Design an enzyme around this catalytic site. Structure first.
Site, short mmCIF file in Angstrom:
data_model
loop_
_atom_site.label_atom_id
_atom_site.label_comp_id
_atom_site.label_asym_id
_atom_site.label_seq_id
_atom_site.Cartn_x
_atom_site.Cartn_y
_atom_site.Cartn_z
N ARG A 55 9.28 14.87 -21.35
CA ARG A 55 8.53 15.21 -22.55
C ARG A 55 7.04 14.98 -22.32
O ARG A 55 6.61 13.84 -22.14
CB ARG A 55 9.02 14.36 -23.71
CG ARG A 55 8.44 14.74 -25.05
CD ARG A 55 8.94 13.83 -26.17
NE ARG A 55 8.29 14.17 -27.44
CZ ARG A 55 7.13 13.67 -27.85
NH1 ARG A 55 6.48 12.79 -27.10
NH2 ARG A 55 6.61 14.04 -29.02
N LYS A 76 0.63 7.85 -22.31
CA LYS A 76 0.88 6.59 -23.02
C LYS A 76 0.08 5.42 -22.47
O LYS A 76 -0.48 5.51 -21.37
CB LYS A 76 2.38 6.27 -23.05
CG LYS A 76 3.12 7.02 -24.15
CD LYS A 76 4.56 6.57 -24.30
CE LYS A 76 5.21 7.30 -25.46
NZ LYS A 76 6.69 7.34 -25.35
N1 HH2 Z 1 12.40 11.15 -27.40
C1 HH2 Z 1 11.11 10.76 -27.47
N2 HH2 Z 1 10.37 11.18 -28.52
C2 HH2 Z 1 9.07 10.82 -28.65
N3 HH2 Z 1 8.35 11.24 -29.69
C3 HH2 Z 1 6.94 10.87 -29.86
C4 HH2 Z 1 6.40 9.98 -28.75
C5 HH2 Z 1 4.95 9.59 -28.84
O1 HH2 Z 1 4.19 10.69 -28.30
P1 HH2 Z 1 3.33 11.68 -29.26
O2 HH2 Z 1 4.23 12.51 -30.09
O3 HH2 Z 1 2.36 12.66 -28.45
O4 HH2 Z 1 2.46 10.63 -30.12
P2 HH2 Z 1 2.55 10.45 -31.72
O5 HH2 Z 1 3.82 9.52 -32.06
O6 HH2 Z 1 1.32 9.67 -32.13
O7 HH2 Z 1 2.75 11.82 -32.34
N4 HH2 Z 1 7.17 9.57 -27.70
C6 HH2 Z 1 8.46 9.96 -27.61
C7 HH2 Z 1 9.36 9.54 -26.49
O8 HH2 Z 1 8.92 8.75 -25.49
N5 HH2 Z 1 10.62 9.98 -26.50
C1 08D Z 2 -2.89 1.67 -29.80
C2 08D Z 2 -1.70 2.33 -29.16
C3 08D Z 2 -0.88 1.74 -28.23
C4 08D Z 2 0.04 2.77 -27.97
N1 08D Z 2 1.12 2.82 -27.15
S1 08D Z 2 1.68 4.17 -26.48
O1 08D Z 2 2.53 3.84 -25.38
O2 08D Z 2 0.59 4.98 -26.01
C5 08D Z 2 2.52 4.96 -27.60
C6 08D Z 2 1.99 6.10 -28.19
C7 08D Z 2 2.71 6.78 -29.17
C8 08D Z 2 3.97 6.32 -29.55
N2 08D Z 2 4.67 6.98 -30.51
C9 08D Z 2 4.51 5.17 -28.96
C10 08D Z 2 3.78 4.49 -27.98
N3 08D Z 2 -0.22 3.89 -28.70
O3 08D Z 2 -1.31 3.60 -29.42
MG MG Z 3 4.30 13.08 -32.16
#
Ligand code: HH2
Ligand code: 08D
Ligand code: MG
Ligand code: HH2
Ligand code: MG
Lengths: 275, 274
Positions: free
Chosen positions: B253, B219
């Site tokens: 996670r 993140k």
């Molecule tokens: N419970 C929980 N679920 C989550 N799901 C997606 C993301 C974001 O990660 P990722 O799925 O790899 O990114 P994207 O939302 O772009 O799929 N973060 C969390 C988290 O911190 N906690």
């Molecule tokens: C741009 C940008 C900032 C940022 N923040 S983050 O912390 O990397 C993040 C990534 C995915 C989700 N679901 C929530 C937060 N992610 O993309």
């Molecule tokens: Mg995801």
């Protein structure tokens, strides 16, 4: 505040990474890797670039069952490296040695810190160290490198480490080394079984009572190897996890092979601690 | 300390690693990587072999800056089905939609991972009918505007108040308290200082006596410190995982399972040494 040597300062309010530069053929994780001067210098620069603020130069392997190194051989391994680094870089130079002659000649070559796993117990070492006026790291060990892993035992590990440190600080002070020039290292892997190593890591913050900087060296050791069942090179993650646990407890200097990874880890630790 | 679903128990006296399986074209670190059915199945076995005890399937990227119900359901359900019929592992679904929840559970899912804490139309009800454990995640705002000036008088007080409200909301709907998991939602309506405050104060959340799930993997809280691209954030992400697990966080996670599992071993050895 800061540790000092020869106009250099080191910020003790943030974890500092000490980069390991072995100049031996038989170091347990990287023997024969940095044996010649040109290779040593490239590795040091790599570690400096990666964010190390100290370079630890060692020409004697002290792994379990390690061979004896002659005084002249250790001198030939260590001193030209100290000299070459001192002339090129703005960085703390630590020398991982127990020999009086290596202590003195390294000091003469521009070294900043005496890292002695034997806590100045070799003939003439205490006197040699005192004359240099430099900071000294004292390390806890049960036994010698030849027999330390032959059934390590403690009634209470932390009590034994405390008693050892108390005894050797007094000894350094009476020899004329100011207390504020001392660092303490509890000696992971030195006369300690797997349980002892993790006990010590779990209770590390208790050692802050001496009000001296803590230096720890867990990097790529058997305490990671035994848990993950992987060779030394594949212990980077386990080693970083140990460094994070130690730094979260306020250990000031972390001695590692893998500088870049540790520095990145220490950033996350500092941002957590300052929040 | 102990969690059971579909006759399969999950030890919570030791840190557990949840592997991320994104099935989206646009996820912030790995969008497009595991989009076809076979690659999703490949990635899951790799994570399983690396030591993941939960696989988290997600058909909707919720990164700062939507997806149709038919588009989302087709991404997840076929993947859930195959994994349930192939592997003996907790399957988790990262979804908010009622239809996704219902059909995913039918396919054999074990846990509902909802970043919106069941707030979408029909979601709370659909989740109740399954009887499955639910993870409730804290978030300020919505993915569309969460990172526009995050603000908190006190971050931890808000998180606690958010969780208190959604626990009661779940219990009132029939979901037993011991089936709930809490995630303070790193990077979800939180700036750099907020994220690290939360990490520093994480252990305070144990007062609810519910399992904590945390997600910091790759993140921006790591990216902003290290100035490296998402895939080079493994070390920073592992450091965050170590700090969280030392404070007793039970589920982590992550994208990088092998690395996190190795680190959790060191954590477990330290914690159980007293
Ligand atoms: N419970 C929980 N679920 C989550 N799901 C997606 C993301 C974001 O990660 P990722 O799925 O790899 O990114 P994207 O939302 O772009 O799929 N973060 C969390 C988290 O911190 N906690
Ligand atoms: C741009 C940008 C900032 C940022 N923040 S983050 O912390 O990397 C993040 C990534 C995915 C989700 N679901 C929530 C937060 N992610 O993309
Ligand atoms: Mg995801
Ligand atoms: N102060 C201190 N010095 C040390 N020197 C060498 C080793 C062993 O690491 P390495 O140098 O790579 O092994 P070897 O003894 O074979 O050279 N560990 C420590 C330590 O934990 N603390
Ligand atoms: Mg050495």
């Amino acid at each position: 505040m800061h540790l000092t040597a020869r106009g250099l300062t080191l910020d003790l309010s943030r974890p500092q990474v000490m980069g390991i530069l072995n100049v031996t053929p038989d170091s347990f994780s990287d023997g024969g890797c940095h044996n010649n001067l040109d290779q040593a210098l490239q590795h040091a620069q790599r570690m400096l670039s990666a964010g190390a603020t100290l370079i630890d130069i060692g020409g004697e392997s002290t792994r379990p069952g390690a061979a004896e190194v002659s005084e002249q051989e250790e001198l030939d391994r260590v001193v030209p490296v100290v000299e070459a680094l001192a002339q090129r870089f703005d960085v703390w130079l630590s020398v991982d040695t127990s020999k009086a002659a290596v202590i003195t000649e390294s000091a003469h070559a521009g070294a900043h810190l005496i890292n002695d796993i034997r806590s100045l117990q070799e003939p003439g070492a205490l006197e040699a160290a005192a004359k240099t006026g430099l900071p000294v790291c004292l390390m806890h060990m049960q036994g010698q490198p030849k027999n330390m892993q032959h059934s390590p035992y403690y009634d209470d590990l932390m009590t034994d480490i405390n008693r050892f440190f108390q005894h050797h600080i007094e000894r350094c002070v009476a020899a004329g080394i100011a207390k504020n020039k001392l660092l303490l290292d509890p000696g992971f892997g030195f006369g300690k079984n797997l349980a002892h190593n993790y006990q010590l890591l779990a209770h590390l913050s208790e050692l802050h009572h001496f009000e001296l900087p803590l230096l720890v060296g867990m990097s790529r050791k058997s305490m990671v190897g035994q848990l993950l069942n992987v060779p030394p090179q594949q212990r980077v993650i386990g080693s970083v996890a140990c460094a994070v646990i130690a730094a979260m407890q306020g250990a000031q200097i972390i001695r590692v092979h893998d500088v870049k990874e540790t520095v990145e880890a220490m950033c996350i630790v500092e941002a957590t601690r300052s929040a």
